[PDB]
Structures are given as structure tokens and as C-alpha cells.
């Protein structure tokens, strides 16, 4: 009822008590463990109010105003107007709240020592796909700083009926297309190749490439979605160039500066926001191990261990594991020499122990999802492969949520 | 109740039934996810039978010989025998399928392709320690057969009492000894610190240096363990040079030949064998990244960086990363160079999957610990990265044990 997650590297223990307050279901049971498992799995009146109870009692306990006066009488607030309205409408002070800590709970992000250090825009008047690609731009604009990137996001009105939803149709802001060839193979990115189909579905004019920016498609209020450019100049883009091999420059490799997630789905006291769009900054290995090196992705090991004079008829001879390792050599250089903020998988694991220890101390724990916090390379070399991690799902949190375009009932 | 895995890099789905018939339980809960826990946690006559039952019947019904008159028949000896004396003997052929079940049933092991090529070497009618030195020794030849090295398994008495065990002290037959120094760092192996010094309490005599072969301690019916060491010709080395840099000969690093756990406890029929020497072969990253450059290991990281030219002032330059694919480019090249059997992470990870596939449809599933399985560095471009595993714990399996000095009743 107390555990205890000890880190095998350090011999430093801590004792978890936050999993009590834990509330969903993690898929494990008491005979199958399913923590590598990728995605695991209306509302009505009577199951909201407990749900804005408890939020609304952690936002009060957490401004040192625990049921007190100025709670019970928004306790109360609350509770008529799910009365009636059957549904209830956020503070902006519990709008920010309940984003920080749903990055906070978010046990897959490695990044969460940055967690109250997140910028909330509130965007709950919006109503058209205009109106969205406004403020998405701004937010686009405000995130990056010219390289010196500043984490953000921007909510869209809660779901009310579930026919009036508001959704960004793209995984994430700023993606590159995926062209499917008459001869099978792919140009741009593969994992977006039916999302760049369905833009030029609506209407896209593609410029069959390489890194083309893809367009924001933009649903609102249920309302069939639409398709609208990112002016070019609000896209930071940072091409790749190695510290040493001057024939990089050649491979003609580029990413994006913004990490910005649109697809997924955040829970604040039982309201579902399923348009919340939030970008950080990258961790090198993103782009450079899963982004680049991927199979199913841009695949570039064949043409970067070429270039490099390299033993590629064997296995063993680990051809891969060295072309790799100067793919990321390159992301990261790229990145500081154009003062576009990036983080190693150093310093952000080191970073995230840190995290860890705070957490456990002023709270009582950290949900962690092992699973993905080690980096997809050097993983042992690294000390978040070395540190036991409870899994569990606290709320406010992040969820997943279908793909639109298999949801919507279109006209 | 008939759960399916996904693969992510080719789609490929299986469905998983064999975890029905699994009976332990994992540790997680529906509001818990244990998977990145480590370790996480006398027998009476009522509880043997069952367990008895429930492994003849998957014997017998494995041989196409379920519930026949030769079935029931040892069903009753079996239930007999544990009226007669509340415990009972395995036969011949039990004794080599529960092993070869118990490896094939380890979720941690990413070698199991192999697990019906096992050699059974029964030791029950071992009674002192020089028998065990004996019969150990036999093993260590076998199993080494000059660098083709062959899977092997030695079985000694099973527990009856409790006060009465036989134990390998040593957590593997062959591993380098560890001595602190007066300055406070560490010659050789950090991790047998203490039981090099145990080694040296019951009366070693320690050459002092790097990778001095340890002795082994072994202890019989309960009885204190006693040294004994290995004949030096029986213990097979490989010295590390890299196929580029001759410096690297000047590192000076070798290792042994023989991966053996000695330390676990093998379960059979709910039968109880304290002392169960296993060994296969490397897989290299256990050598090249856990055992060179674990921090707490050798932590050779400083010195091939040095002596590779690298840029060791930012964390950001991957050094790291980059003088650890030579380390197991090294490792890899070294055995291989002298016939000794190693594998890559790349061909034991494609194995693995391909042993998935088999398992999926001969039995209904595989019983996969992803923490465990994907390797230590390079882990995305290795296809366990990308494969969904559900972990459950079946019987007969191989299971931890304490280490003997904190439970022996000494004399
Ligand atoms: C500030 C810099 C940040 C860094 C370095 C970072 C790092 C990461 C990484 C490496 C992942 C794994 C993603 C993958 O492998 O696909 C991740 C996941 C995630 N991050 Fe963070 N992140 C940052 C900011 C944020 C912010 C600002 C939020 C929310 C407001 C957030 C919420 C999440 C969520 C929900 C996931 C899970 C995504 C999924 O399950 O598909 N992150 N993060
Ligand atoms: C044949 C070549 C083999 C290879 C390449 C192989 C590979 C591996 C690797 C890499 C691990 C993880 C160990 C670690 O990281 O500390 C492991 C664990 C394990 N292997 Fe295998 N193995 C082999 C043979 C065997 C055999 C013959 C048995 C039993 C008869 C076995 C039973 C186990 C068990 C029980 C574990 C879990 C160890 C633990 O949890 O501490 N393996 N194996
Ligand atoms: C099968 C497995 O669950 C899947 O490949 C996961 C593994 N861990 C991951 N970890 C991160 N950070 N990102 C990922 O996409 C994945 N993919
Ligand atoms: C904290 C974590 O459970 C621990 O470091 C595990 C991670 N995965 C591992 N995987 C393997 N193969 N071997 C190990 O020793 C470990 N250690
Ligand atoms: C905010 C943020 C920062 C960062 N550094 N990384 C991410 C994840 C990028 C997208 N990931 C693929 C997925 F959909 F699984 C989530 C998000
Ligand atoms: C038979 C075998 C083969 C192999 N290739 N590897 C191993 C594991 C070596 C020891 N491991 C450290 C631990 F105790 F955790 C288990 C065992
Ligand atoms: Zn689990």
C-alpha cells in the first residue's frame, strides 16, 4: 500500500503513495502485464459530478484553500449547473491547472520537469475553422520564439453532445507528406501517407516532395473540416549538417523545429477537450532515431552508412548501431548551431530523475511508463534504464482518441 | 480471453490464448503496471498434488498420450508417493521436459528459439561438494565444446526439508572477481565485490588483478559451502581487439566464453531444485554494454572515448554513444575471429520474433517481458522495439532465489 521503486544504478529508493489516488484502469491484471502494449483499452450527469469533485478538491488543496468557504460555495456552483445544463464550464485559473497537470500526469513524457512551466491559451470562444487556424497560428508563432522554443497549448471547446466536436484532423501541426509511388515506394513520410491522401481528398494541391508541410485540416463544431496553410515563414525548419562528414549536407536532410501533438484528447474534471493542441521542444533521438531511422519511416540507415565507408554485408558487423549514432550527431549539432532549443537523451533522462525525486518528495510519487521513457538508443548507457517506475493513470490527463475520419458522420 | 499482440513495424498481428492457462501472478494489478519492477514478489503435501497433475498432464499430453492408462497410472503413482513420503521423484523424461519448459516459459530470455536443443544433465544422485565441483566441471566442458558452445542445464537434488539445500553460491560459474581498494575505487568487478570477499572469509587466495576467474563455492545437503577452482584449461577466453583500432589491444579487455546462471531456482511439478547451472551463449550487448559499460560495472566509456579522439567536454556530443558501437563491434569481431558462438542483438532480436511467430501457433502464445527482451542499446532498430508482448508467468519456469549467506544457518 506504500511501494517502493528502487534505482538499481545509484541504489536510491523511493516510496510511491500518489498510486492510491490513482483512479483508471491500466490494462495489467493480477496475471498479465500489458506494459508494452501500444493502445490499451456521451456522458451522462450522474458521473460528473464526482469527477468535478475531485478536481475541484486538488485545485483547492493545492492553493493552501482545501474546504474552505471559497471551495464549498464552487462545489456548489458546480453541482447546479450540472443540474442544469447537465455539464459545467472551467475558470480559466482551473483551465491552467488542469492542463499543467495533465502534463504532469502524462507517465509517457520525459520531459515533465518542465511541467508548470507551460503555457495555457484559452480558446473555448472560438467558433469556425477560421477561427482555429487563428489561433493555431498564434500559437505556432508564440511556441517557437524564433528557435527559442516555450511550451504551449491551445483548448478548443469541450465536447458538449458529441456530434458538435471540435478536431484538428492531423496528428500533429506541423508533419512532412507521404507520397505513395506508381512503383510502391514512398516519398515524404510514410506514417502520414492516407492523412495526405485525405488532404488532397478535400483538396490539397501537393507538391509531390520531399518535406512538404502539410496543411492544417481543421473541423469545428462538428462541421466537415477545412483546409488551410501554415504561412511559411511561422514553420522553423532546421536543415541537418554532420560536424565532420561535409557529404551530409549532401543526404539533404531538414526537420521541423515545433513538436506539436493535435490528435489526442484532454480530460479536466470529466470535460473532454478533443481539441488541445501542444508542442514542446524535441528530444534529439525523436528525429533522429525513430523519425530518420525507422523502418517504416524515412529509413535513412542504407544511405547514411554508405556514405560512410561501412561493412554493410553482415549483420554482426553493426553497421547500423555506427550510422546511427552520427545521424544523431548531426540532429543535435544542427539544432544549437541555429539556436533551435533540443534536448540530448543525456540530459533529458538525467533530467527526468531529477523530476522523479521531486516528485516522490511533494507529492508523493510519479506515474512512469518504462516502456517509453528509455530512449529508443543507448538505452543502458542512459539512468532512466536503470530506475524501477510505477505505472499508474492519474487525472486530469491526456488520452487517446480515434481518428476522425473513421468517427465523423460526414455530409 | 483471447488477447491480441500487434506488431508496429510490419502489422503483423497474433492472438495470444496460452496466457489462459497461466497460474502466477505478475505483480500488477488493474490500477498498477509492475513491468519495469526487477525482482518483484517450506511446501506442504496438500499444495503437491495439484501442481503435480497439472505438469503430468501437460507431459503426458504433449508425448500425444493425454489421459491414457500410462497417464493415470503415474498420476496415481505420483499421488501415491506423495501420501507415502509427502513429496515424490520425477522420471528420467519428466525431469528433461520440465527443464526445457522452464527455459522455453522464461519471459526475460531472448534466446528461447533454442529451447527445445537443451542437454539435461541430471545430478540427483549427488551428495557432497566435490561431487558438485564434479559434475560442474563436466558441464563447463560440455557446454564450451572448444567455442561451439551447446546449451546445457546440470540438476542437482531437489529441496526436501528446506534445511537441507544444495546451493551454488557463485550467481554464475565463471565470472571475474571484484576487489575495493584503499582508495575506495574498484579492480576487476564491482558486482562480485562481496562475494569476492566472501571467497576470500572461507579462504581464497586472491590474485589481486582485473579478470581473475573466481572459485566456485558450493554448497551440499544443507552442509557449508566449500572452495573449489575451476581448471583453468576448462575456462575459455576470448581477448577483445577491434578490427580497425590496434589500440584497442592495449585495453587490455577479455572475457569468458560461457554464459552460466548458477544463482536460480528451477520448479518442476511444484518440485523445488535449489541448484540448476544453466548456460547458452552471448548475446554481445550483454558483454559490450551491461558488463563494459554499465556504470557500476567496468565503466570503460572514459577510456575508449580517450582513445578514440572524441569531443568528451558536452553531453550533447554522444561520445558516449559512439565509443559504445565500437565496444561491441569489438566484442562481436573478437569471438568471432576465434569460433566462439556469439550472436548480435540484430540476429537474437529477428530469431525472436521469428520464435514468436512459432510459438503463436503451436501453442497459442509466448510469454514476452519487453523491459527484458529489447536490447540495451540500439533499441528501435531492433524489431522487438516494435512488437507488442504480453508477459504471464507459466510453469515449470525458472524463478529467483535469495542469495544462500543471508538464509543459511551457518556452523
Ligand atoms: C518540453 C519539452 C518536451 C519534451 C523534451 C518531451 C519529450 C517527450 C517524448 C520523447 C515523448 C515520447 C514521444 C514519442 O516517442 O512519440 C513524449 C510523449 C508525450 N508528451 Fe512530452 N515532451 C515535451 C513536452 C510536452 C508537453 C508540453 C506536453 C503536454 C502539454 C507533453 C505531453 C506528452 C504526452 C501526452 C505524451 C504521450 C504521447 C503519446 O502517448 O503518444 N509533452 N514527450
Ligand atoms: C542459447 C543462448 C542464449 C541466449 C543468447 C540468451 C539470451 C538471454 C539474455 C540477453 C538474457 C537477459 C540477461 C541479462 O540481461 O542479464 C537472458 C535471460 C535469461 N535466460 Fe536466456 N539466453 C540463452 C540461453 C538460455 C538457457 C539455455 C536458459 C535456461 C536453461 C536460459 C534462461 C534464461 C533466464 C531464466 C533468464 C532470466 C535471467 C534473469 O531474470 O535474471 N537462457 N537470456
Ligand atoms: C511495442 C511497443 O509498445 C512500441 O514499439 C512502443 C515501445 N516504446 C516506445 N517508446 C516511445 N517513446 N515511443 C514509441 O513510439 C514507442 N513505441
Ligand atoms: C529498472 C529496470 O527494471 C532494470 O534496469 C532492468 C531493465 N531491463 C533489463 N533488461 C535486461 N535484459 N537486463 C537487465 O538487467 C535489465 N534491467
Ligand atoms: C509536445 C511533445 C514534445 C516532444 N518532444 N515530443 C512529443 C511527441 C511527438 C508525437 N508522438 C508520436 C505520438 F503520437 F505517439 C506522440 C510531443
Ligand atoms: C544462459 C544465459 C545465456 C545468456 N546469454 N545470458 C544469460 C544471463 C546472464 C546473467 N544475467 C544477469 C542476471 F542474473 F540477471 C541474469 C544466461
Ligand atoms: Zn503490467
Redesign the interface.
Known sequence: RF?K??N??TDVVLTDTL?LK?????????????????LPSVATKDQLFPLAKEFLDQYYSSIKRFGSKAHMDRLEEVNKEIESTSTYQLKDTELIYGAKHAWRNASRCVGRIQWSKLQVFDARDCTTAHGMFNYICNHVKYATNKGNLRSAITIFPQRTDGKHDFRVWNSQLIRYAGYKQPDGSTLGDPANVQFTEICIQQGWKAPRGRFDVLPLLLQANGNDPELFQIPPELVLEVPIRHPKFDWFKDLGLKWYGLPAVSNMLLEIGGLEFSACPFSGWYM?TEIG??DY????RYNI?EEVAKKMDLDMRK????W???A???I??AV?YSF?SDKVTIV?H??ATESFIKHMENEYRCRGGCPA???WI????????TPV?H???????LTPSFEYQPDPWNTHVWK
Open positions: 511501494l521503486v528502487k538499481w544504478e498510486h490513482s483512479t483508471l484502469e491500466t490494462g495489467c491484471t493480477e496475471h498479465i502485464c500489458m506494459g508494452s502494449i501500444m534529439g532515431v525513430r531511422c525507422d523502418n517504416s540507415l549483420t554482426s558487423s553493426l547500423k548501431d555506427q546511427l549514432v552520427e544523431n550527431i543535435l544549437q540530448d543525456h540530459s511508463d518504462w516502456v528509455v530512449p529508443p538508443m543507448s538505452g543502458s548507457i534504464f530506475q524501477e517506475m510505477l505505472n499508474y493513470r
